[PDB]
Amino acid sequence: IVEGSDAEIGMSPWQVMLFRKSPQELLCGASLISDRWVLTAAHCLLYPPWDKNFTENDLLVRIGKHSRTRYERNIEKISMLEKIYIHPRYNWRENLDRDIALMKLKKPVAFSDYIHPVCLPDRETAASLLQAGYKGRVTGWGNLKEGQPSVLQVVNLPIVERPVCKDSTRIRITDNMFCAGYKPDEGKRGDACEGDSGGPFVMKSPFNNRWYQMGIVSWGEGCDRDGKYGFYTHVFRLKKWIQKVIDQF
């Protein structure tokens, strides 16, 4: 995260760390959406251009963490993967369209003060809060600049108008994507960065006061560059895919 702050303890109890077994190291962000389902970006697991294609057996998810590197005894839980599911139309060849994946844990994770699922939005929550100007929050252990944080980092970011997202890049942006970030104008700044990938873009509903994951950290051009904005997978847009996978398995 660029230009963000240390998280408070318990602040993002749904925050999940994707971890490489050997070499042990951070893979990506991710989130907890029930007791054995973890939501992340497809490109965390599959990205042929960089020779990324993981299997279940190559990974663990580390739930309830605060510190990046330390094995938080008595606090974090670490689970194994029953099965990786990637969106069957995820577009890694062109623009990361539908950048999304589900992970089933081998056994259920025990909820605690530091571990708790986030909600997934409903059309109406999605319709009400997915508005230019509306701020969401992004969290992750990724780069601090376009180095590494000691603890989970956090930044709040405004959702940017669609033509501005579009006018900010050469890539083709779709309806399964949104962008967030301040303008050069707005003085304030902040952004996700490499290693934040697959983490949650969440919002707090003013209607029922629960947190909803509206987005997944997906991509950008540099980190925290003026006139550039971060791109997020539009979680409501693919929720019928999320439900299908969940129902079926």
Binding site: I33, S112, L129
Partner: peptide, 27 residues
């Protein structure tokens, strides 16, 4: 059912230090 409610914050009716910046953005 209890998603999105944080044991150390909403369940204790404790606010985090910047959650209001989100609220305030929600005209």
């Amino acid at each position: 059912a209890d998603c999105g409610l944080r044991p150390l914050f909403e369940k204790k009716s404790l606010e985090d230090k910047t959650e209001r910046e989100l609220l305030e953005s929600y005209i």
